[PDB]
Amino acid sequence: YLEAFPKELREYYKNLFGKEEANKIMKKLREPVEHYYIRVNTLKISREKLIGELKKEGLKPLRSPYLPEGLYFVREGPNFSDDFEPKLPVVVANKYAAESVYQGAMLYAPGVLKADKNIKEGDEVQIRDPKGLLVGIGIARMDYKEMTEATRGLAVEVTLPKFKLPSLSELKAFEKGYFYPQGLPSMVTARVLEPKEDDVIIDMAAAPGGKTTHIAQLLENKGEIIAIDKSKNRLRKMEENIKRLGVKNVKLVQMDARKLPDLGIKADKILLDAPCTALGVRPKLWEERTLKHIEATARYQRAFIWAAIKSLRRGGVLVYSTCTLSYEENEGNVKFMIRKGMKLEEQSIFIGSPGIGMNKVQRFYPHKHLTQGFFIAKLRKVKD
Numbered sequence: 001y002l003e004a005f006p007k008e009l010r011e012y013y014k015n016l017f018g019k020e021e022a023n024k025i026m027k028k029l030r031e032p033v034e035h036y037y038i039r040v041n042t043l044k045i046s047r048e049k050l051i052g053e054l055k056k057e058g059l060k061p062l063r064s065p066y067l068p069e070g071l072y073f074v075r076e077g078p079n080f081s082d083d084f085e086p087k088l089p090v091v092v093a094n095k096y097a098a099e100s101v102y103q104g105a106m107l108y109a110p111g112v113l114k115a116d117k118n119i120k121e122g123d124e125v126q127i128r129d130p131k132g133l134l135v136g137i138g139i140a141r142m143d144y145k146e147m148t149e150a151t152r153g154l155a156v157e158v159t160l161p162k163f164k165l166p167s168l169s170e171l172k173a174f175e176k177g178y179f180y181p182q183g184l185p186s187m188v189t190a191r192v193l194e195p196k197e198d199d200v201i202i203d204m205a206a207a208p209g210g211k212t213t214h215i216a217q218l219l220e221n222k223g224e225i226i227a228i229d230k231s232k233n234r235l236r237k238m239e240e241n242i243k244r245l246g247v248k249n250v251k252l253v254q255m256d257a258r259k260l261p262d263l264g265i266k267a268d269k270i271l272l273d274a275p276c277t278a279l280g281v282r283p284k285l286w287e288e289r290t291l292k293h294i295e296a297t298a299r300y301q302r303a304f305i306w307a308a309i310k311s312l313r314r315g316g317v318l319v320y321s322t323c324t325l326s327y328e329e330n331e332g333n334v335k336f337m338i339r340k341g342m343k344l345e346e347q348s349i350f351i352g353s354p355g356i357g358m359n360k361v362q363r364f365y366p367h368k369h370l371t372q373g374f375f376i377a378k379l380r381k382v383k384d
């Protein structure tokens, strides 16, 4: 599994976590989350009612004893060994199709990069990513010719994916806005912010609106939430999410959030779920980002942070989060905040790990918490 991670990043991990933990982290990072979480949209339905609805569809949701809006599904797999060499014609899926097949998705024609020419419908085939990673096995529903030419349709029915997570996007319950798939650490993030109906609230990197809409249901659609993003496409997806979830709480504004103080607002609560190297996301088939990205991104996040701090009222609260493991983007950027008049505060929910040489921040690790790698800091603005 170590091959998925560039050599200098591997050394970085070993240095930062210690060899043993680093090897455990990278090994687990290559796999999908063991517990696949979704958020109950309490704006439209209760947890237990939704459970009832999901059991109807043959799903086995489990309740979180920490998040009353939390449900999770247990992952299946691995369904074959890491060294398994099936005696099968190969279908090569592109980078994106391979990752979904890796988690139980079917393989559709546009997801096909190239294939063995002997493949005819009904043949048992193996599916590999462009770098030879075996991600799944299944039965071809197209001949080679149609497989490499079709623009739509089912190409391989994946009957033996490496791992299996439930597909929820096609459920009636999903279309009706009953839930929003979202990791446990992300749900913790919105809770730890503790939004009030009174608060002036800003989500300055909000799209597609996962944490924003969570705040909305915690507010029970009261108050107002200002949600900022630079990407129009992602904001467009956020608009759809808001409508589907029945969110009436949120004001969308498109802009570079680094210029946030250009508005005249001093917020009581700011969520900064910052763009990051995403070193913690799962599954991690091949990590492309490395050390140069950590430094560059860490510096890029500082602009957001400083923008937030200036836009906070004294006594105001900032919640900073990333889905990355690096020190520089996490504990290091919090030291920055401490030098800028912010103070660390106890988070209302702490089920992850302590930070690196740092006490009140919260880290999540895949091998310890069965989640994506994650980081959460909660700060109080004591002065300007």
Ligand SMILES: C[S@@+](CC[C@H](N)C(=O)[O-])C[C@H]1O[C@@H](n2cnc3c(N)ncnc32)[C@H](O)[C@@H]1O
Binding pocket: 204, 205, 206, 207, 208, 209, 210, 211, 212, 228, 229, 230, 231, 234, 255, 256, 257, 258, 273, 274, 275, 276
């Ligand atoms: C980690 S994602 C945020 C996800 C969000 N917190 C959620 O729960 O769904 C980072 C987002 O920040 C946005 N972004 C990146 N640079 C930005 C900038 N300079 N100004 C405003 N938004 C930016 C990206 O469009 C991206 O959608």
